[PDB]
Structure formats: structure tokens, C-alpha cells
Amino acid sequence: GSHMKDVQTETFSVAESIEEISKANEEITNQLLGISKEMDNISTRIESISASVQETTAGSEEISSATKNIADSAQQAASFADQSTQLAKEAGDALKKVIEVTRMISNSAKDVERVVESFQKGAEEITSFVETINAIAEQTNLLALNAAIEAARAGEAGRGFAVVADEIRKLAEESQQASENVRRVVNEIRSIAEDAGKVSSEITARVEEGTKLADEADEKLNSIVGAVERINEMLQNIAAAIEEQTAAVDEITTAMTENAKNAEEITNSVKEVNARLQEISASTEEVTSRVQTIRENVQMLKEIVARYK
Amino acid sequence: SHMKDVQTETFSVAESIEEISKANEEITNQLLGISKEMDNISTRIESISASVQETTAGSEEISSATKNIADSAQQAASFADQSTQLAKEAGDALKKVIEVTRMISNSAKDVERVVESFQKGAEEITSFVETINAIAEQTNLLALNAAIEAARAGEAGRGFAVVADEIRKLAEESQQASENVRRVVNEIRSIAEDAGKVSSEITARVEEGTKLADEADEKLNSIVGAVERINEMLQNIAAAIEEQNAAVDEITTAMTENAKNAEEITNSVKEVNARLQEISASTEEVTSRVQTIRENVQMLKEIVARY
Ligand SMILES: [Pb+2]
Ligand SMILES: [Pb+2]
């Protein structure tokens, strides 16, 4: 009696307990389903993260190639800056030596007023020397004609006097013709002498206007040098940017190989996780199959209580 | 007698609780491995996040540099402009020196002409020395000839011996003017040879003034070529600047998703770790009920003997 009424109380508790194990094991199989969906999310995301790595490598490759173009285009631009700097120092040295030439044009052209006025001096000098010869001539002429006219008034012997006096008068007026000719040339000499002072004033004016006008290009040449040394200063800043770019691109490629090495280990850990889950599912399967061998046996004790008890 | 089926049933319920316990132990061990493998995904993820920040930072200064280069280049482009403008004038002020030069080259031509009119003006003037002198020496002899006979006639030579005399004397003054002219013409003649240098030392010195200015000419168009290569070279970096900005835009958008996915993974580790904890609990629910059945399978084997 109490021998079977306890065999019942007993099988009541085990039938009651095994049923809790069945749901505790049902709760477990569910959690396993959720874990998998999360393991696949890791997997899928670990695939996109891997794709994120390829895009970037492409960017480091474009950047580098781009920084190489910039490092070379600049390395060559700077070289023309020294060529422009040299053609400047050169064009500078040339132009400053044209002034030296123009300054020699100063003293050398100066020696001209000595010449223009030395000839201009032979004006009243020669003109007065000639004006005197005119006076002498017209006086010999009047003097000569007077003997000739006065001598002729006597007669016989006056013939002889009138002849010589008249030939002297003829020569007297030959000197007057000579003097009126030596005059036109001394007057021409005048203009060609005076109108010449007008050129000494033009060459001196053109010496100064052309000389300082040369030193306008010299400053302009100086300004390109400055302009060019600023350009070089600019290429130099560009070198430094390039250096920063080469360093920054590198640390990026290291950070990117590091991602491939970490995404791989997650993929492998996910792999290990999945296996471990497939083994959890195994043991969970063994509890389900054994919850049968207990329930069957827990109600097989029922018909033994109905009879014996 | 039938405590036959009590034993055959209290035998099976003892042989199964035995496997549940074992299955529950396998479950517990695996659970401990997953947590372990789980906490490792966390570490690698933290490391992936760092790489993302290192890349973003790297990608950022890559941008500062690109802008810095874009600016520096722009400015250099200006300076080259300021340079070409000065190459227009450097050539300009010279297109003025060649014209000032050709003006003075001709003003120098004016002088040989001057000096030529003087040399000719002096050779023509000497024949007048010759002519006047001659005429004066003829007048002299003639006036002497008149005196050597005017005194003769009779008391009629009175005024004729007087005139012949002053004629001779007048003719003696003409010799003087000529000798003084001869003196000055000579001074004038030597002026010509002295003037020679200034005359051609000019076309000579203006000549090489033109040479030096023309060398500065070529040395100057050669810069507009040198500064032309620089613009072309500078033009090659502007084009590289568009790639870099594009390259940083491709890199930022990549790193942007990589940040998302890293969070999406961390968030998944969080779910799993919590789900694992629910099963540990379920594992314990089972380990507690394994005991209750053992007691209830032991108290039953007591019946097997008792009865
Ligand atoms: Pb850095
Ligand atoms: Pb198992």
C-alpha cells in the first residue's frame, strides 16, 4: 500500500521533473536559433568590412600615383625657376652694361661742343678777315678809278697811267667777286656749325631718356627674380605637403592590412563558434530522445498502481 | 512478483537521466568555449575600430595636404603671371632702346655731314687764299709800275704818285688778312681729325649698345618659355588635385560603412553573449532536475529490495 502509494508519489515527481527538463531544453534549442542568425550577421558584415578594405586600397593607389605626379611636376617646375633666375641675373648684367656704353656716349659725345664752337669761332674771325678784304677792295677800286678818270683828262702820258690804273681797278673788283663768294661759304659754314648745336642737344636728350629708360627693364628683371623666388618658395611648401601625403598614405595601408588580418580571425572564430553550436545541438538532440525513454517509463508505472495498489 | 516492471522501468529512467547529465555537461563545456571565442571577436573588433580611426585621420590630413597644395599651386600661378607681365615691359623698354639707338645713330650721321661741310668748306676757302693773294701781288707790282712812271710825266704826277703808293700799301694789307686766314683755316682743318673719334666712336658704341639689348631680348623671350613650362607643370598638379579629393571621398565612404558594420558586429556579440547566459540558466535548470530524478530513482531501487 504505502509501498505503492510512494512508488506513485515518486513517479509523480519524476514525470513532473522530466517535463521541466523538456522545456528547459526547448528554451535552449531556441536560443541556439537566435545565435545563428547573429553569427551570420557577423559573417555578412565581416564580408562587407572586407569589401570596405578593397575600396580603400584603390584609394591609396590613386593617391600615391597622384602624389607622384605632383612630386615630379613640381620637381621640374622648380628647375625652370633657376633657369629663369639665371636668365634674369644675365639679362640684368647685360642691360647694366649698355648704360656703361651709354655713359661712354656721354664723355665721347661731349667732345663735340669743343668741335662745334671751335668752328663757330671761325665766324667773325674769318668773316671779319673777309669784311676787311672787302673794304680794302672797294677802296682800291674807287682809288684806282680816280687816277684813271683823272689821268685821262690830261692826254698823251695819261694814256699810260689810265691803262695801269684801270687794270688795277679790274683786279680790284676781281677781289670783290672773290670776297662775295668766300662769304656764302662762311655763311653756310655758320648754319652747318650752329644747326649742329641742335644735334648735341638731341643726342644728350636721347642719351638720358634712353639710359634711365633701360633701368626700367632692370627693375622689372628684379621683380621677376622676386616673383620667381616666391614660386620656388611655393614649390618648397608643396614638397612638404607631399611628404605629409606620403606618410599619411602609408599609415593608411598599414591600418588596412591590419583589418584583413583581424577580419580573418573573426571569420575563423565565427567558424569555431558554428561548429561548437552544431555540437550543442547534438547533446540537445540526446535529451529530446531521452525525454521519451523516461515519459514512456513514467506512465508505464501507472498501470502498476491501478493493479497492485 | 511484478516488481519486475518496477525495476525494468526504474532501470531505464536511471540510464537516461545519466545521459541527460552527460548531454548537459557537453552543453556546458561548449558554452564555455563559445564565450571564450565570443570575447575574442570583441578584441579583433576593437582592433578593427582603431584601424578605422587611423584611416580616417590618415585620410583627413591627406585632405589638408591636398588643399594646402591646391592653395600653394594657385599662388605660384599668380607669381608666374606677375612674371610674364614684366617680360612684356622688359622687352618694351628695349623696343624703346633700339629706337633711341637708331635715332642717335642718325644724329651721329649728322656730324660727319657737319665735319664734311667743314672740310669742304675749308678746301674751298683755301682757293680764296690763293686767289686773293695772287690778285694782291699783281696789284703790288702794278702799283709799283705806276709809281716808277707816275713820278715822271711832269708836275702832273702829283696825285698819281700818291695813289700808286697807297694802292701798294692797300695791297700790302690784303696779304695780311690772307696770312691770318691761312692760320685759322689750318686750325680748322686739324679740328677734323680730332673730331673723328666722337664721330665714329659713336656708331661704334651705339652698335654694341644694340647688341647687349638684343641679347637681353632673347634672354627674355626665353623666360616666357621657362615660365610657360611652369604653368604647364602647375597645370599637371591641379589635375592631380581632383583625383585626391575623389580618392578621399572614396576612402571616407568606405570607412563610413566599415564603422557601421563594426558596430553591427559588436551589437551581435552582445546578443549572443546574453543568449548564452539564458542557456547556462537552462543548463542549471536541468542539472537541478537531474538530481531530483536520481533521488527519485534511488528511493525506487529501495522498493526493489524492500519488497
Ligand atoms: Pb599621420
Ligand atoms: Pb551527446
Swiss-Prot record, chain B:
Family to which this protein belongs: Belongs to the methyl-accepting chemotaxis (MCP) protein family.
Q: Which residues carry this modification: Glutamate methyl ester (Gln)?
A: Q53
Q: How does it sit in the membrane?
A: Multi-pass membrane protein
Identify the segment of the full-length protein shown. Answer: 225 to 528 of 530
Where does this polypeptide localize?
Answer: Cell membrane
According to UniProt, the name of this protein is: Methyl-accepting chemotaxis protein 2
Q: Which residue positions does Glutamate methyl ester (Glu) occur at?
A: E60, E284
Q: Give the sites modified to Deamidated glutamine.
A: Q277
**Can you provide one Gene Ontology molecular function annotated for this UniProt record?**
transmembrane signaling receptor activity
Q: Which GO terms describe its biological process?
A: chemotaxis; signal transduction
Which Gene Ontology CC terms are recorded?
plasma membrane
The chain positions of domain Methyl-accepting transducer read 23-259
**Gene name on record?**
mcp2
Alphabetical UniProt keywords: Cell membrane, Chemotaxis, Membrane, Methylation, Transducer, Transmembrane, Transmembrane helix
Role noted for this protein:
Chemotactic-signal transducers respond to changes in the concentration of attractants and repellents in the environment, transduce a signal from the outside to the inside of the cell, and facilitate sensory adaptation through the variation of the level of methylation.
Lineage per the UniProt record: Bacteria, Thermotogati, Thermotogota, Thermotogae, Thermotogales
* Organism in which the protein naturally occurs: Thermotoga maritima (strain ATCC 43589 / DSM 3109 / JCM 10099 / NBRC 100826 / MSB8)
